Design a protein around this nucleic acid. Structure first.
Lengths: 131, 63, 394
RNA sequence: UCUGGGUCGGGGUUUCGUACGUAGCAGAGCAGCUCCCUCGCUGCGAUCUAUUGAAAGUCAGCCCUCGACACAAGGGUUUGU
RNA sequence: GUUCAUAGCGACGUCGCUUUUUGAUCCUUCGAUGUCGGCUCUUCCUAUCAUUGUGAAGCAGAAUUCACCAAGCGUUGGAUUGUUCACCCACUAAUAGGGAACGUGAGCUGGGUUUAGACCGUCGUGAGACAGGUUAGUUUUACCCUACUGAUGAUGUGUUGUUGCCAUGGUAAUCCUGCUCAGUACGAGAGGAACCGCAGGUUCAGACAUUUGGUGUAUGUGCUUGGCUGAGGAGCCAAUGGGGCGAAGCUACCAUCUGUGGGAUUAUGACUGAACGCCUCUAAGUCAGAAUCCCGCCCAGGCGGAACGAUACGGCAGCGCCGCG
RNA sequence: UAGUGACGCGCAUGAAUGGAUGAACGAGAUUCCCACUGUCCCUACCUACUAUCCAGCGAAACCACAGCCAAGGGAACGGGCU
RNA sequence: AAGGUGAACAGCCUCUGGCAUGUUGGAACAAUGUAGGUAAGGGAAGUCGGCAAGCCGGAUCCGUAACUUCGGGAUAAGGAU
RNA sequence: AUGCCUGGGCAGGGCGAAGCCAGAGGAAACUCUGGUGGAGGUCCGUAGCGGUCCUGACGUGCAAAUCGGUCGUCCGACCUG
């Protein structure tokens, strides 16, 4: 029912975010962003709570060298809320997810943005702190 | 309209202005402007900076 | 050969006479179609842009994620002092177009309106409408005026009113008032002409023409930017750094076989100072100007039922590069074309405004008053004094 | 001639962050004098404290001044149904 | 193709269309038309990938291919290769095919063809040859005319000013997701819609700085290295000395606001209705009909008009209406 | 289709027309990683010197005549012809 | 072949000495440029190719691998002041 | 371009070879530790010499081959009258 209410996105294709779940992965190199038509020479950009495809550049060999769906939780780029507050989380952090939205891990380290929490209920359920 | 207090200076932050910073350790700060934001990010202690409300309280200025 | 990777063109082909506007005041290219059932009413007004600020309010759109939540919107202030009606004009529809039939001016005309008819006011002797006002003080002139009004009633199809702004009540340097034709939409031509004649030499406030929570159109000249390159004028792609003969230029203009440059090619030239007509601007608040009963009444400008303060829309130190707003003002959602001090034309919407977002009622909760001349942090000087305490300059 | 604009000055706002000087029983300490007294006196001494949210800038493309100054029908080229 | 030629195909034969491939000729150019790609940019074509409107099934829904009006709007980001071409990864409604001197070098790059220096393999006694590979190898000139983007302007309206009209040109918006319908219609089950509504987003267009960010030589205010005014103070030099914060102004889907309605109809589905005592959307006549076309919204405004104001008191003047010479 | 390690079936590798190896070195040619950044996403702002205007001084290339387009034919892509 | 900083005949500032900024000046600070810079988030995703720019940079104290012709690599790499 | 004769010139730093001194171990052969020494067609680097890259500026130029940054070498097969 609730809309996305687009915000500033600062995670283009090639950004290496840190994994924030107990799956075992350390880094997540973003290879593309879902739901983007695209434009000429315009790199796809991912914001908070955006479904992306990533690859584990560092971590367990089982998770390395394969594509995983993921959801961006925190971004260092400041985004504006609907009530006029600009928020940034000091780091770019994401969690590995499947197609239906179920997290592959069991816990999330650090805060989780309210946009991602509202968009993905399971990530909100596993979230420790909100925004 | 919930008016916040600046985590560094202490001035009231109206909804239109200010900035919000959520650190990874799990706590949130409100900054009145980029000056206070940079002062906080540079690890400067607010009690040693004269214009800060904490400095004024510490030195018992006014009243 | 063909273009490998398709991409949309840069700029709009329907907006590219890229010339400085011949006119400075916004022209109403099309007035609303008059239905001969509603009462008579003016369809336009002339204001002056002052500045922008914040607004805080609760939205009432069910189903949205932000429903019943506090939101902030950028609002633009347009100072709109009441305008003086000084003349009327009739238009008759012809197979060639819409020809002006008869123009009748009032007896007494203010010097602000008289200034417009003279390029140089200091040098001139101010002789405009000297023998014309004699028609209002003679029996033959009165008979001629009555005959002209009867002819306009019989023949004219469209009736417009000449109204000029009051430049005295503004902080702007200039004193030359802006005149404008406003088409009257309402009942029959006879009743419309009678109302226009009655409104002669009279003030018109903004409450008569526009109301709260209304969608209107803003017409004005873009803030000029002078000669600009293609990279800024059409936002074309920048050439790589290795380019020899410049990089902020369009690389390929056209093909070989057509030995001419097409009008659709992005070229360097004038950017800004373009006539524009923004539509669907929402009136958040029509604020009353300064009035005196025993003392100054400045609360009516910015005080709300939830703030109940003594603040006016003027921030600390006044609006930057405009002045202090003391007259009636209109607060519009979002930004409007033009720079500060710029005259803008407010026009009633040309479309049936029946939409979920266009019919929403606006109830303000907080109006920002922090100084815009930097990073302001105090809403009012009283609050600033209370927070700071006594200073050395006391 | 809605008397107007200009210069200066005063406030409002805003930017930076606490001015020179003075005083201190603050100050890692050190030296001289001698009433060898080492909280005795006199000096050097990063810095600190009160004066002091002080000092400094602020329209040249920010707002009010109606506070002081001079000036403001004057200069040249024109066009006729 | 379970039955069945024409739902979708189609052998043995046969008729055509295109110059987006290679061919044949040498017609223009050897007193020189700069020889591949890639980047940027504009326009055009339909042999339609997707979106709008429909006809079709071996169309129950979903999915689907076949055909029609249809080029308005879209046709992406990357690993490899100089590559066109080619393959793979991911997203997406789709990643459809092409032309414009195989568009585009006084626009750019020079990566490899294609000078001169060299290395390797084959051939030749040899100098040398290799659509056999590798490396380094100067990309000149616009101030001329036209075209285009902007800017003064120009002939008429007796002169100027005013508010306006309009012929003409340009034109703009596009697509998708979530909730409800609905786990409903349909279907043995698995599966699984559609219309109207609500919230919004992709690309594009026009603006603007209240907020966030950027710039910052107000060289605004502190802090500092070297040196120089004897020192304190106040300063300056070191092509902007360096480094914090930073007013105003410009600026970023890196912030914010807005983006519209009618008419005629195409394909198609129909009404009445003979030709053809029956039947028929067609022969007369009539209805519905869309990203189509045109107009409206919007930009400019014609060797085009509009009514209105003042029209040279002068120290010499100069004009406007009337009448009869 | 690049880089590295193994296989030999080597159009046409190969032993002073020298084969293999090789510490150090190379303004020699390539592949990958760390950090770094406007190469880019996506451009924006500031400074100096020009470009702009003015006073003075002041050239050169080029020039059949000159310069608005659609189609046709032509010597097979016209500013002139229809 | 002066003084200061400095390892230094490095760069920068100053004294003796030399000069008018290098075949002209004035007014604004438009677009293209030439030479310098700065940029939120990503960090080579651009491009034939990290082209260009940027990063590290002095000194003191620790530490320093593979290989090797045992000489080197080496200021290896990486840390603190 | 090369050979010869006769003259001139080449800051400041890093690595620390032969040789030597002292201490410790050894039964000898001799070996380890701390110093001294400054050799090298040695390394960073100025003057000098040359011209990689930006295929930068200019390209009817300052110049019929110049300028900026970045560059190789700089005690010897060095540069030069």
């Amino acid at each position: 029912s609730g809309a996305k209410f687009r915000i500033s996105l600062g995670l283009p294709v090639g950004a290496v975010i840190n994994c924030a779940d107990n799956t075992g992965a350390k880094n997540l190199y973003i290879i593309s962003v879902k739901g983007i038509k695209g434009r000429l020479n315009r790199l796809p950009a991912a914001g908070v709570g955006d479904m992306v495809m990533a690859t584990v550049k560092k971590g367990k060999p089982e998770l390395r060298k394969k594509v995983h769906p993921a959801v961006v939780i925190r971004q260092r780029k400041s985004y504006r809320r609907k009530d006029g507050v600009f928020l940034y989380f000091e780091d770019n952090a994401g969690v590995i997810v499947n197609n239906k939205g179920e997290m592959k891990g069991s816990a999330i380290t650090g805060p989780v943005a309210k946009e991602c929490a509202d968009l993905w209920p399971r990530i909100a359920s596993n979230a420790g702190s909100i925004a | 309209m919930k008016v916040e207090l600046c985590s560094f200076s202490g001035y009231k932050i109206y909804p239109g202005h200010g900035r919000r910073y959520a650190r990874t350790d799990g706590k949130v700060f409100q900054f009145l402007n980029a000056k206070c934001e940079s002062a906080f990010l540079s690890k400067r202690n607010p009690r040693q900076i004269n214009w800060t409300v904490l400095y004024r309280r510490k030195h018992k200025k006014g009243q | 050969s063909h273009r490998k990777f398709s991409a949309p063109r840069h700029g709009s082909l329907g907006f590219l006479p890229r010339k400085r506007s011949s006119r400075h005041r916004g022209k109403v290219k099309s007035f609303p179609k008059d239905d001969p059932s509603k009462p008579v009413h003016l369809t336009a007004f002339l204001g002056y842009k002052a500045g922008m600020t914040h607004i805080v309010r609760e939205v009432d759109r069910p189903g949205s994620k932000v429903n019943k939540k506090e939101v902030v919107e950028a609002v633009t202030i347009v100072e709109t002092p009441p305008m003086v009606v000084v003349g009327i004009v009739g238009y008759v529809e012809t197979p060639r177009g819409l020809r002006t039939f008869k123009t009748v001016f009032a007896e007494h005309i203010s010097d602000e309106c008289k200034r417009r008819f003279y390029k140089n006011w200091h040098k001139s002797k101010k002789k405009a409408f000297t023998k014309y006002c004699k028609k209002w003080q003679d029996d033959a002139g009165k008979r001629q005026l009555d005959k002209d009004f009867s002819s306009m009633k019989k023949y004219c199809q469209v009736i417009r009113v000449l109204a000029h702004t009051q430049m005295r009540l503004l902080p702007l340097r200039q004193k030359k008032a802006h005149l404008m034709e406003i088409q009257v939409n309402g009942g029959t031509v006879a009743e419309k002409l009678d109302w226009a004649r009655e409104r002669l030499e009279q003030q018109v406030p903004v409450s008569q023409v526009f109301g709260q929570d209304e969608m209107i159109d803003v017409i004005g000249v873009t803030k000029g930017k002078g000669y600009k390159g293609v990279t800024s004028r059409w936002h074309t792609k920048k050439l790589p750094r290795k380019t020899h003969r410049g990089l902020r230029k369009v690389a390929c203009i056209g093909a070989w076989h057509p030995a001419r440059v097409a009008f659709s090619v992005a070229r360097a030239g004038q950017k800004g100072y373009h006539h524009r007509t923004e539509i669907n601007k929402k009136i958040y608040k029509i604020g009353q100007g300064y009035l005196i009963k025993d003392g100054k009444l400045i609360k009516n400008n910015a005080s709300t039922d939830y703030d109940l303060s003594d603040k006016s829309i003027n921030p600390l130190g006044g609006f930057v590069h405009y002045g202090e707003v003391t007259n009636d003002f209109v607060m519009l959602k979002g930004c409007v074309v033009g720079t500060k001090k710029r005259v803008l034309t407010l026009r009633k919407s040309l479309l049936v405004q029946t939409k979920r977002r266009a019919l929403e009622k606006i109830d303000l909760k907080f109006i920002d008053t922090t100084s815009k001349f930097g990073h302001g942090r105090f809403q009012t000087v009283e609050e600033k004094k209370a927070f700071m305490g006594p200073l050395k300059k006391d």
